[PDB]
């Protein structure tokens, strides 16, 4: 075999590159940032109809002002979320304030390269971290197992990502309303998903300064799905 | 580094089997056969010694049958040296239980812990598994007489009659044929010896190539006695059933 922390001849880490392939097999997750809030949406993708879909948990709260969506080997995300929550709460204990979204993201990314011969392999999951703080407002971050994170205005991860990202390149502008972003996530998810999108196999969420991070009901998302179908037929 | 020389003893095959466990079982299938039979009034342990030499000291010898405590014994098939490591652990475990609760250890509890140690060597540590299969024969006041077997995987099961080591397939078929539930110890002694006699790779079964033991309530009133048979006693029991 070969060392876990080995470089390829092109100057890349084999294990990090291979974990990126695992993430491409994951279910689609989309995030869009506006000046009214950040929306996070995911494809649930139940493997069988007997599986109770509301037990699929791919959107998760980190703190009141920070939420998170995942794609890839989702079991790998549990300890990442556990670290994120502890980092967020610990900072509030030490400083009597909310931790910045970027600082949270940097803390999670510090775990990433802590593998070798520390854990035995990189994480097989990518994270979309969305939140609000007083300094830099509404923010969306893409956290990779490489230890790198980029800020995004909008971003898709998973199997439908490169098609969904090209769509997000055309649709996003700096004046989108929250409602406009909600519909846009639903629209683009419906495009890249295999099975037909409804309230049971897709999930929406948002973070706003006023109400914090909220996962939407299946009833609330169903009405946004109906509002979307009516608007596309209306021209 | 040293990665080059690592056999990776604790990994799965593409089929979902544990290489080293499978190969250890293959090793055990060449060891001398051992049989356990559970009757309503006791248990029989019978085992065949591995091809003997005439100059071997037969009486002061122990290879197959070991005493764990006054109520539990084991029959061994595999590497003896590996078995003694495990037997000493089992002996200590029994005494720990007795020291803690002031009661003799229930058979299954002892069997589970010994099996759990084996399991560990197949999941972590990069070491080869123990090349040993045990037949446990014992008594406690909850289930009475019990037979168990454990193997290198750390999996254990309970039996009315069972064989380990060489020719288990033929031995099991023969035991399945003549065993019945209302059987007595002296009937079980005969079945055990008859089965080994028919499955043996030797020319003829003699006293010097056998170890024998019984666990009876055949002491005096409500208590259990372990009898590890002496050479002459095996010679007599072999004549009494007309094998020699």
């Amino acid at each position: 075999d070969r060392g876990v922390s080995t470089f390829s001849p092109e100057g890349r880490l084999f294990q990090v590159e291979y974990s990126l392939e695992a993430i491409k097999l994951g279910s689609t997750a989309i995030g869009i940032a506006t000046k009214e809030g950040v929306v996070l949406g995911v494809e649930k993708r139940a493997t069988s109809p007997l599986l109770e879909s509301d037990s699929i948990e791919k959107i998760v709260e980190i703190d009141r002002h920070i939420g998170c969506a995942m794609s890839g080997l989702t079991a790998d995300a549990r300890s990442m979320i556990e670290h994120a929550r502890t980092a967020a709460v610990t900072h509030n204990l030490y400083y009597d304030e909310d931790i910045n979204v970027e600082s949270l993201t940097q803390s999670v990314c510090d775990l990433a390269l802590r593998f070798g011969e520390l854990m035995s392999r990189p994480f097989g999951v990518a994270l979309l971290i969305a939140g609000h703080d007083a300094d830099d407002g509404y923010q969306l971050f893409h956290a990779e197992p490489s230890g790198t994170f980029y800020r995004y205005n909008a971003k898709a991860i998973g199997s439908g990502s490169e098609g969904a990202q090209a769509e997000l390149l055309n649709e996003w502008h700096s004046s989108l309303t929250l409602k406009e972003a909600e519909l846009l996530v639903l629209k683009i998810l419906k495009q890249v998903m295999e099975e037909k999108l409804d309230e049971n196999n897709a999930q929406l969420s948002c973070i706003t300064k006023q109400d914090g991070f909220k996962i939407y009901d299946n009833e609330k998302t169903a009405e946004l799905i109906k509002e979307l179908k009516e608007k596309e037929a209306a021209e | 580094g040293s990665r080059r020389y690592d056999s990776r003893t604790t990994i799965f095959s593409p089929e979902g089997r544990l290489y080293q466990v499978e190969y250890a079982l293959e090793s055990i299938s060449h060891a001398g056969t051992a049989i356990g039979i559970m009757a309503s009034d006791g248990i029989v342990l019978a085992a065949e010694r591995k091809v003997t030499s005439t100059l071997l000291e037969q009486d002061t010898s122990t290879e197959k049958l070991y005493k764990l405590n006054d109520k539990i014994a084991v029959a061994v098939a595999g590497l003896t040296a590996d078995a003694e490591i495990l037997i000493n652990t089992a002996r200590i475990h029994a005494q720990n239980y007795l020291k803690t609760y002031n009661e003799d250890i229930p058979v299954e509890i002892l069997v589970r812990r010994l099996s759990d140690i084996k399991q560990g060597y197949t999941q972590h540590g990069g070491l080869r598994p123990f090349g040993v299969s045990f037949i446990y024969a014992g008594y406690d006041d909850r289930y009475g007489y019990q037979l168990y077997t454990s193997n290198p995987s750390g999996n254990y099961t309970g039996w009315k009659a069972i064989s380990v080591g060489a020719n288990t397939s033929a031995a099991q078929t023969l035991l399945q044929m003549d065993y019945k539930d209302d059987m007595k110890v002296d009937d079980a002694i005969e079945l055990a010896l008859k089965t080994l006699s028919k499955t043996t790779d030797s020319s003829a079964l003699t006293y010097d190539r056998l170890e024998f033991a019984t666990i009876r309530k055949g002491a005096n009133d409500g208590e259990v006695y372990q009898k590890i048979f002496k050479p002459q006693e095996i010679k007599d029991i072999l004549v009494k059933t007309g094998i020699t």
Partner: protein
């Protein structure tokens, strides 16, 4: 037996107005009935418009100020040069002090 504590005397005082705050302290430093220095300042500018004094055992006072000053430096390094608010400084100093709960900094602290 070795006594790890001493008393360097002096006194400090803080008052807050509507759009300002003062932190005063005398400059005398003593041990027993002797004067060590007539001018040894114990009120310090720690950055981010925070002034601090830790009065009592000067060795502990200096050690604490030194650690908090260093804490302000790393707060910038770790949180994109964000200004450390006075309430956040207070909470941070609590942890600096309580971390030595069973071998305390022998000081009264005012920021």
């Amino acid at each position: 037996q070795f006594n790890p504590y001493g008393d360097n005397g002096g006194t400090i005082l803080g008052i807050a107005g509507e759009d300002f705050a003062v932190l005063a302290g005398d400059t005398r430093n003593i041990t027993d009935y002797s004067i060590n220095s007539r001018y040894e300042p114990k009120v310090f500018d720690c950055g981010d418009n925070i002034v601090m004094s830790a009065n009592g055992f000067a060795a502990d006072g200096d050690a604490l100020v030194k650690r908090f000053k260093n804490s302000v430096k790393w707060y910038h390094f770790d949180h994109n040069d964000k200004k450390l608010s006075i309430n956040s400084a207070a909470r941070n100093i609590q942890h600096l002090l309580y971390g030595k709960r069973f071998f305390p900094y022998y000081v009264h602290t005012i920021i």
